[PDB]
Symmetry: C5
Subunit: 65 residues, 5 copies
């Protein structure tokens, strides 16, 4: 019983993180109104993609649960 309740809450926080990640993307998007800035934003886009995969992973793990 406790496995399902803990699991449900876990997936919930994840979504909130993803949504918190989208606010950053908006700032990244809006912030794109020089080489350093461009290189940094790419890194930020790379980090965000990584966050995307981390979330998919948790979903894959949940499937097994």
């Amino acid at each position: 019983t406790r496995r399902k309740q803990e699991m449900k809450r876990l997936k919930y926080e994840m979504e909130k993180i993803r949504e918190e990640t989208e606010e950053v993307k908006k700032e990244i998007e809006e912030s794109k109104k020089s080489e350093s800035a461009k290189n940094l934003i790419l890194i930020m886009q790379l980090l965000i993609n990584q966050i995307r995969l981390l979330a998919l992973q948790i979903r894959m793990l949940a499937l097994q649960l």
Copy 2:
């Protein structure tokens, strides 16, 4: 049986402690962003936001495995 669960409980605390330290830094980062910063410091803060978000995902992932090992 119990030893297997014990190590799983110890490792869970090592995460929880890490989650704490990370959440505190987030607060300090939030306090840095209100006080306007340099154009470079801004991007560095935004990157820190993402890395923090990854830490938290990774903490969720450790709770996931711990469930699966529970059963």
Copy 3:
């Protein structure tokens, strides 16, 4: 259950296959940037990017594995 899990699994792998393609385009932009001449700092940025890309790939592999651990 069986058909919903599969689809949810399929969309996970599918949506994953898009993120990998996105990272590849950035890899080509950076490698053109890697060719052009840039300061020591910018070069190190490029290097840092290349590491990020490589460790995206390993997360992708991890998902592919989990999928197969689910499929089999």
Copy 4:
């Protein structure tokens, strides 16, 4: 065979990251620019990640073992 290699390779990683952690603390003992401190934060966040991946590995080991 695989376990020891995995553990040995991991325990080895714990050392190479400690080599990085020492430099940070030595850095922090030296006077820095504001820009530096932001990087030191990033390296601290990065190390936190490494700490967590390491705990995941033990979790995975815990499972497969039994």
Copy 5:
């Protein structure tokens, strides 16, 4: 059968990844051979952390395979 073709891709896929990180590692060592600003030294320490993270993921994959 198909899962076997996937392992073929996955084993190769990795070692291609392991070669590229080595390529970055080669640039870090040659980087360190020249005088470096305080910032770029912190950059290097960062990418060394990233390389470590790559090591850990590969182990997870290996352990997920076992």
